[PDB]
Amino acid sequence: LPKSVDWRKKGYVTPVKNQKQCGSAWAFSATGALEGQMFRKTGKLVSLSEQNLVDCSRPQGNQGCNGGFMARAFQYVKENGGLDSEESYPYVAVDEICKYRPENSVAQDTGFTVVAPGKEKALMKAVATVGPISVAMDAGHSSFQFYKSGIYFEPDCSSKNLDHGVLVVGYGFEGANSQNSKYWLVKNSWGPEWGSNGYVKIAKDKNNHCGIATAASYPNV
Ligand SMILES: [Cl-]
Ligand SMILES: [Cl-]
Ligand SMILES: [Cl-]
C-alpha cells in the first residue's frame, strides 16, 4: 500500500460543510463518501444533499437531526434509486418533509461495502484502493472540540462507544519514517473554522484510536 494518501489532492473531496445544530453528521459522512465515488466514476465533483438524507431515510432506520448511520444512508440511496444535489435540495439543519425529486438525482449506489471491524489495516487498504471512507468515531471530548494542530490523541477516547460520523480522506505520517508518527486525515462537518480548516489528524496504528476502524463503510457505485 502507499506510504500516504490524500484524496483531496486528486479532486475527490468537496469543501468543508457545517451541520450546525442538527445531529446529522452521519449524513455528511455519507454524502462525502458518495461524492468521492461519483467522482471516481464520472470525473465530476458534485456536492450532494444531506437534507435529502435527513428528510427521507427514516424508513431505513435513520432519525434525521436526532442521529443516524452511514450504512443506512447508503441503503436508502440504493432502495430509492437516487440522491439529489446539494444545490437542488439545500441544507437547513432541521427535520423537514421529504422532497426527493428523481429528476434532480446526481448519484446512485447498489449497496455498500463494510470494512472489517476494528481493523486499521483493513481501513488503510480501503482508503488506498477506493477513495474517501465513511467512519464512525468517538468525538465527545472538549479536546476534540478545540482541536487545532498535531496528531490528535485523547486518553478518554473509546474505540467502542461512538457518537459521530466523519470521512477519512487519506492517511500520512510525520517526519521521514513512514512507519511511525502515523495519522488518519479526517474531514469533519463542523465548518472550515473548526479544527485545521475543518480537518483533523487522528492517531493511526494506536489501537484503533477513537474507533476510526470500528464501523467503516463505503457506497458501491
Ligand atoms: Cl454506519
Ligand atoms: Cl499538524
Ligand atoms: Cl489543509
Side-chain angles (χ1 to χ4, degrees):
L1 304 176
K3 299 172 166 167
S4 65
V5 171
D6 185 350
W7 295 103
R8 299 172 299 174
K9 286 179 171 191
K10 300 153 107 306
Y12 283 59
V13 186
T14 59
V16 174
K17 306 180 183 179
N18 194 337
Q19 71 187 86
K20 302 282 185 36
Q21 297 304 122
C22 163
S24 54
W26 57 276
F28 290 83
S29 174
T31 56
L34 195 56
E35 287 157 355
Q37 294 306 288
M38 289 309 298
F39 184 81
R40 174 192 180 203
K41 174 177 190 107
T42 72
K44 303 288 170 173
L45 182 72
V46 180
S47 186
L48 303 175
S49 179
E50 296 77 23
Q51 196 69 48
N52 184 172
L53 297 173
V54 162
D55 300 345
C56 311
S57 63
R58 283 180 183 269
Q60 290 78 25
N62 291 325
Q63 294 190 33
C65 288
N66 190 44
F69 298 96
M70 293 79 76
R72 295 175 181 177
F74 309 133
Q75 182 195 336
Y76 161 85
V77 174
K78 178 195 79 170
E79 301 180 353
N80 190 62
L83 182 67
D84 291 336
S85 65
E86 178 87 72
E87 187 134 272
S88 72
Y89 199 151
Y91 187 68
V92 294
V94 293
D95 299 285
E96 299 201 328
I97 298 297
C98 181
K99 295 176 285 293
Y100 174 68
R101 297 172 63 178
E103 72 272 22
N104 291 332
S105 177
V106 294
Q108 290 186 124
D109 69 46
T110 64
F112 64 87
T113 298
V114 177
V115 174
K119 304 187 199 199
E120 285 188 273
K121 192 72 173 191
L123 174 64
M124 187 182 167
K125 183 164 167 194
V127 174
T129 67
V130 176
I133 306 299
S134 292
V135 307
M137 72 172 289
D138 174 13
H141 295 98
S142 318
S143 59
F144 198 64
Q145 292 268 347
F146 302 92
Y147 171 83
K148 196 52 60 169
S149 297
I151 297 177
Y152 183 75
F153 189 83
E154 170 54 69
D156 298 341
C157 245
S158 176
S159 300
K160 282 174 265 190
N161 301 319
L162 319 180
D163 62 6
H164 187 52
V166 294
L167 184 76
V168 173
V169 300
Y171 58 82
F173 60 89
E174 307 287 8
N177 193 330
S178 72
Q179 303 303 121
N180 69 352
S181 44
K182 305 183 277 203
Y183 55 82
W184 295 105
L185 291 166
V186 174
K187 190 191 195 196
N188 203 357
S189 53
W190 294 350
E193 309 82 2
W194 176 79
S196 213
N197 310 306
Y199 290 87
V200 56
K201 290 173 185 171
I202 295 180
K204 174 169 175 284
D205 201 4
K206 290 299 171 204
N207 291 326
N208 190 22
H209 198 58
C210 302
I212 196 112
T214 297
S217 67
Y218 62 88
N220 297 142
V221 301

